[PDB]
Design a protein around this nucleic acid. Structure first.
Lengths: 805, 112, 46, 134
RNA sequence: UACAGUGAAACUGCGAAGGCUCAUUAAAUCAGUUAUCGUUUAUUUGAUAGUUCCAUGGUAUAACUGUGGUAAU
């Protein structure tokens, strides 16, 4: 028996008193028998606590089996052998046999996103992904501990990088070292030996706070004032949280109770229970509302809202993936998809989840609607809301599982979820000349992830810039861009000569999907028995069958992000893009001029994105070739993804011209099946493919016009008679629905067609009908534009007849 | 998924945790005994042909050779009712078991 | 059972009484525990 | 897509009535293209021949090879044998409704996909016979 | 320097080769007895095997090794 330390139980005691989480980081070999001791101290300081414990791992267990029948029969034959007495058990076996543990895989950590745990035991260190850490510690409760078991190798790496800045020899990853430096910053973490000694090399001193939530009694007073109707029963059921959350829930109840069309979009964090207040106000809607409701989250993603709606129903008055059919003991509410219920908007009540702004503007149009915007684009959503609904948009970001922790600060830091969207440059008038100058800097990611407060400030600015108004990426992309070997960045921030600091107008991300370097990394990663890190090289070499793109290197744009302040920010982004093309053609500090004056051997450079209007405009400023696509509309925004690249190497003429030609052939045939979005940018991308053929090919990749025999083989003489009939007479489908496909293919293949004929050819390439596309895009004079397009059809009749015979 | 690949005449074998499902999508609805090409599955193993032999999916259940139906089915073996996964490899495997017989253009350092 | 050691963890008034990289753990537990109080910033004048 | 919501079994009935009317008047004095290799190489490119034969003799995507899923079904209609199951799948593709749309209508997704793979493999053997014979 | 004494796991030979509760069957249960050239019979016991034209026979598979899946036999 030996007394341990004055800091490690006192941290637990003041943590469960002031409602703040704590971090134990155990090192050593016999590291399994020591966690029930910490569990008993955590329980003994506060019996009034959550009881369950998480034991997430990546691949395997420590020495135990998570199967009570397995360890029971194993210890039964141990008693039959006779090296262990009958009444005997060690405290780790007592822990796993008595307590309630959830053992989840690190790969399937998503199955516990809503429920609460009193302990979290992150088992392995070497794959600690920030999405998983941000999922765990947001659910660990306020008097809670999180425990992390380390290695001999990771203990050596901590002893190495706990002097100043050093690193380990023999992909390399720096997010683990950023986490170790984050816990060196936090005083709510402590490293503990196998013999319960304490390492004061991270959070050394801690005291016993004095012997003892004024807002919680205020929440009780709010509940009592609401109490002393069915709204009071719902409010006393609802307010299980901060009084600001109670205020938002009661205000939503009183907003959609007697009224009938406002639209309120409340924004909450991962805490504060946005779906909780929504599900508890659903019963207030079901009592003092219509008998029909409209739910608009994604499919099988609102089980928490279903749980809160069922708890509200139970509290007031009750009785190909899931079972989501509604119930009734007295009305209907069902979780609809994207905006196909524009005909079924006879319901008065509607609510939606976080973010497509156009799809959220479409379905929520003629009824009383709310939204719940999560933190985990909302500024543009609220701006399009204010520019259009008695806006009672109010939700709170008070902490629900704690008051606020230094471990919560370390969660925000090591998950890089803190942002400050002030400009803080020299000037915008000094940044426009910086866009004219276009002097870029390299990343030097090892020193960038080496966290000093200057380095954390630069990484904070670049991280909020890159995550600001993106296509909804995540901490997996954060850990990837922090520890991918075939990756870098570029930022041309300040042109002026002020003091220490700066800004970041536009960051970019390149991904060297190479030949030599990717061959080296693939042969290295096969020894590590993992690895698949080449997307743009693998998609085009299988789609368009490119021996040339297989034998060359490649650079794929992982992301590019600037401000959303004005068009000048995207102008600076285009200038940084041209500066990157100039850079590819033409410890240590966390910036580089030598690597900004150095480059690699890459075969092509370009980016893939969804087929968007503004992204297509950026692709046109880019004008790099928009190659062959995939028609698959991603289920988030319904957009199809395509890759536009430029051949920036010695001889990319044959590869660029051939891929652009095959893409231009394939886009007309794919422009009817699953790509019929809008005529303007699609025909502009067809002209982009034509200008790509002009830039990359001169006289080799050139087909001639269709011959006399080809024009006599495609149509017939009956086509010429029906063409003269449509010329001198009406133009119904009796003679223009035989030859329309040949006319569209010959018109976009082979002497010139104007804007109205090109819009008619766009409708006929999307295979649409008469008054739909013409009176949707141009939206005037359907019959007059149709007769002018029929005059163009008579011109095409004379064209084919005079070309052939 | 995972690929447990074995070369017979030297007597060696190695596993890869292979991410990026679009390379593994070549294997869908391709039953036991069917030969595959290295092109759609890798760029670093091209010229590599494999004969699959099923493999344990999640819940550790085998694939008994030559029946049907990439789901789970209950049948009789050595004569009791036991559940197996079918013949055809499906989307939710753990490991596919491969035998390499023709070497390709990029040499291996654990198998070869 | 408070006042006694369920496990090996005996509870005093405040104290906790427990009963249970070799050289690395040796140095870190013996001398190199509170050595990194002034090893944190390492000449980082922000 | 002049109708775009007409029925596939009604389309098989229309193709059957058109085929009976075109086959039995006295005898059809209007011959089709009996394996013209330059015409096959002119309509579909050599990239199209290599792409269709690659997606047949290996595994590629039907969504990655559906550029030849429009004119080839009409070529099998007018100018090889396809019974009225694979003919109805090709008729749904000629009405440009999805393979999922015809598959969750009639049999099943992998069912209609493997049946269309059989039809495209027979069409690949036909184009292989033409391109090898000339 | 092709086997060598203890020897953690397997097969083999054998072992467990004879015991609780509930409704109440009158020479049909049961016993003695004849027969079985009407018949099954390991074991014990007694007897009892004559067809060869122009230096010793092939692989399939355990244990054994090795890569893996599963919360898990």
């Amino acid at each position: 028996k030996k007394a341990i330390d004055s800091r490690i139980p006192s941290l637990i005691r003041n943590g469960v008193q002031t409602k703040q989480r704590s971090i134990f980081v155990i090192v050593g070999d016999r590291a399994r028998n020591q966690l029930p001791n910490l569990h008993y101290l955590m329980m003994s300081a506060d019996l009034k606590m959550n009881k369950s414990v998480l034991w997430a791992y990546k691949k395997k267990l420590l020495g135990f089996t998570s199967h009570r029948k397995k360890r029971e029969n194993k210890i039964k034959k141990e008693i039959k052998r006779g090296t262990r007495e009958v009444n005997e058990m060690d405290p780790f076996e007592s822990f796993i046999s008595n307590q309630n543990i959830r053992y989840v895989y690190y790969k399937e950590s998503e199955k516990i996103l809503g429920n609460t745990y009193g302990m979290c035991i992150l088992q392995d260190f070497e794959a600690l992904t920030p999405n998983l850490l941000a999922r765990t510690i947001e659910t660990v409760e306020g008097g809670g501990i999180v425990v992390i078991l380390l290695k001999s190798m990771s203990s050596l790496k901590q002893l190495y990088t706990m002097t100043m800045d050093v690193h380990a020899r023999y992909v390399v990853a720096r997010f683990n070292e950023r986490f170790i430096l984050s816990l060196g910053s936090n005083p709510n973490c402590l490293v503990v030996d196998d013999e319960l000694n304490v390492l004061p090399l991270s959070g050394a001193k801690n005291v016993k706070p004095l012997p003892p939530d004024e807002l919680p009694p205020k929440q009780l007073e709010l509940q009592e004032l609401k109490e002393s109707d069915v709204q009071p029963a719902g409010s006393l059921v609802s307010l299980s949280k901060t009084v600001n959350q109670a205020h938002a829930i009661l205000s939503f109840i009183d907003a959609i109770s007697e009224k009938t069309v406002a639209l309120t979009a409340g924004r909450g964090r991962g805490k504060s229970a946005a779906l909780g207040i929504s599900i508890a106000a659903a019963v207030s809607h079901g009592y003092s509302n219509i008998f029909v409701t409209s739910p608009s989250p994604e499919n099988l993603k609102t089980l928490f809202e279903f749980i809160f709606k069922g708890f509200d129903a139970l509290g007031y008055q009750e009785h190909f993936n899931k079972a989501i059919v509604r119930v009734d003991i007295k009305q209907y509410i069902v979780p609809q998809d994207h905006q196909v219920l524009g005909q079924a908007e006879l319901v008065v009540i509607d609510e939606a989840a976080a973010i497509i702004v156009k799809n959220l503007l479409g379905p929520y149009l003629v009824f009383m609607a709310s939204t719940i915007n999560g933190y985990e684009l909302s500024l543009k959503l609220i701006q399009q809301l204010r520019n259009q609904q008695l806006r009672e948009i109010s939700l709170d970001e008070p902490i629900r599982y704690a008051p606020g922790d230094p471990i919560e600060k370390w969660l925000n830091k090591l998950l890089c979820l803190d942002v400050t969207l002030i400009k803080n440059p020299r000037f915008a008038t000094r940044g426009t000349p910086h866009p004219s100058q276009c002097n870029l800097f390299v990343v030097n990611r090892d020193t960038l992830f080496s966290y000093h407060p200057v380095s954390e400030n630069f990484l904070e600015k670049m991280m909020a810039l890159y995550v600001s108004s993106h296509y909804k990426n995540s901490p997996n992309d954060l850990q990837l861009m922090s520890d991918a070997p075939a990756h870098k960045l570029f930022v041309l921030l300040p042109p002026i000569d002020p003091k220490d600091g700066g800004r970041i107008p536009d960051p970019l991300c390149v991904i060297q999907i190479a030949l030599e370097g990717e061959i080296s990394k693939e042969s290295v990663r096969n020894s590590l028995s993992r690895g698949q890190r080449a997307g743009g090289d693998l998609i085009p070499w299988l789609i368009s069958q490119q021996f040339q793109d297989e034998e060359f290197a490649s650079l794929s744009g992982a992301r590019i992000v600037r401000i959303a302040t004005n068009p000048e920010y995207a102008s600076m982004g285009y200038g940084s893009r041209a500066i990157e093309l100039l850079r590819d053609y033409f410890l240590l500090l966390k910036l580089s001029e030598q690597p900004p004056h150095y480059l690699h051997y890459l075969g092509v450079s370009y980016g893939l994105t969804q087929s968007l209007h503004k992204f297509w405009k950026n692709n046109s400023f880019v004008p790099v070739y928009l190659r062959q696509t995939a028609n698959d509309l991603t289920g988030e925004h319904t957009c199809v993804m395509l890759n536009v690249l430029e051949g920036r190497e010695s001889n990319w003429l044959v590869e660029f011209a051939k891929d652009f030609r095959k893409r231009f052939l394939s886009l007309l045939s794919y422009d009817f099946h699953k790509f019929t979005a809008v005529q303007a940018l699609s025909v502009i991308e067809s002209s982009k493919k034509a200008q790509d053929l002009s830039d990359d090919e001169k006289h080799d990749n050139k087909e001639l016009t269709r011959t006399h025999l080809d024009d006599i083989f495609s149509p017939f003489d009956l086509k010429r008679l029906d063409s003269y009939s449509n010329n001198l007479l009406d133009y119904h489908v009796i003679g223009d629905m035989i030859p329309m496909l040949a006319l569209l293919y010959f018109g976009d293949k082979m002497s010139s067609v104007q804007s109205a004929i090109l819009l008619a050819i766009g409708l006929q390439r999307k295979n649409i009908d008469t008054i739909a596309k013409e009176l949707n895009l141009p939206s005037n004079q359907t019959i007059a534009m149709f007769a002018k397009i029929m005059r163009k059809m008579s011109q095409y009749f004379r064209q084919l007849l005079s070309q052939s015979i | 998924m995972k690929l447990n690949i074995s070369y017979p005449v030297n007597g060696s074998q190695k596993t890869f945790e292979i991410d990026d499902e679009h390379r593994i999508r070549v294997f869908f609805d391709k039953r036991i005994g069917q030969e595959v090409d290295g092109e759609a599955v890798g760029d670093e193993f091209k010229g590599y042909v494999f004969k699959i032999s099923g493999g344990n999916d999640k819940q550790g259940f085998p694939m008994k050779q030559g029946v049907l139906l990439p789901t789970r089915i209950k049948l009789l073996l050595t004569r009791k009712r036991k559940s197996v996964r079918g013949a055809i490899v499906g989307p939710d495997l753990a490991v596919l078991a491969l035998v390499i017989v023709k070497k390709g253009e990029q040499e291996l350092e654990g198998l070869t | 059972a408070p006042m006694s050691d369920v496990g090996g963890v005996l509870m005093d008034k405040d104290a906790v009484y427990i009963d249970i990289e070799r050289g690395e753990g040796e140095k870190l537990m013996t001398g190199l525990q509170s050595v990194e109080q002034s090893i944190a910033e390492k000449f980082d004048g922000v």
